[PDB]
Amino acid sequence: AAVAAGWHLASFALNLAFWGVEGMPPDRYWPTSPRIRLQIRPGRYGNMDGGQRVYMDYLARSEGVPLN
C-alpha cells in the first residue's frame, strides 16, 4: 500500500514543482480562451436587450465582488 501511494505522491509533488506559468511562453495553437480556439460567437436570436444586465452580475458573481 505504501508503494502504491508513493507513486501518486511523487506525481503530485512533481505537479506542485510547477507552481504556475512562469517559464511557459505563449503558444498560437493553444490560446487561453477556448472561444477563440473553438470559433464560438453569438448570433441573432436568443438576444435579450436586458440580458446584458444579467451578464454583469454573473461577472460580479465570479469577480467575487460581494456587492452584487
Partner: peptide, 8 residues
C-alpha cells in the same frame, strides 16, 4: 522545454 518544471 514544456513538460518539465523550470526548478528541476
Amino acid at each position: 522545454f514544456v513538460g518539465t518544471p523550470p526548478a528541476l
